[PDB]
């Protein structure tokens, strides 16, 4: 339990630091900025277009086909930070739809597909466009939501 206990402590402290605008580490800052960006993306998307999850239609036999058809079109002509947030939000919605349909078995698979796509097809762009540090500079401190509300 030693390492699970350290993990629980770190998660809790990271959360409480984030609530006051602080961070446990650079990685925690990235995670937080991405959480906040996803929340805001999904808010904008559902007000304009529909709840994303409600639009998704998955079964274990075609789950990757569903994922790939969307992700390949999203990035067909290139990458930018807004599309990277969209990618995360889509994967989140696909996982929620899967569990809605009693198919939590698909969640691990989706996470793997996302990590692989990030590594193979997004990271090369990220590492030439300022890296995750730039993502935090641009989206951290709930920046996207703050701009809209302004």
């Amino acid at each position: 339990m030693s390492q699970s206990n350290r993990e629980l402590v770190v998660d809790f402290l990271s959360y409480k630091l984030s609530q006051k605008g602080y961070s446990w580490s650079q990685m925690a800052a990235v995670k937080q900025a991405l959480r906040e960006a996803g929340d805001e993306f999904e808010l904008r998307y559902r007000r304009a277009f529909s709840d994303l999850t409600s639009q998704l239609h998955i079964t274990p036999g075609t789950a990757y086909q569903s994922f790939e058809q969307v992700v390949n079109e999203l990035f067909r002509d290139g990458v930018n930070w807004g599309r990277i947030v969209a990618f995360f939000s889509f994967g989140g919605a696909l996982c929620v739809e899967s569990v809605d349909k009693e198919m939590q078995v698909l969640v691990s698979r989706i996470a793997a597909w996302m990590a692989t796509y990030l590594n193979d097809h997004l990271e090369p762009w990220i590492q030439e466009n300022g890296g995750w540090d730039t993502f935090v500079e641009l989206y951290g401190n709930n920046a996207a939501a703050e701009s809209r509300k302004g």
């Binding site: 960006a37 805001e40 993306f41 904008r44 998307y45 304009a48 277009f49 529909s50 994303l52 639009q55 998704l56 058809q69 969307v70 992700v71 079109e73 999203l74 930018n80 930070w81 807004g82 599309r83 947030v85 969209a86 990618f87 939000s89 889509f90 641009l138 989206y139 920046a143 996207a144």
Partner: peptide, 18 residues
Amino acid sequence: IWIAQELRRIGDEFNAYY
């Protein structure tokens, strides 16, 4: 490709230095 075009709606108009 409904979903992806209208992710690219929000994502391009979420995209941020310029």
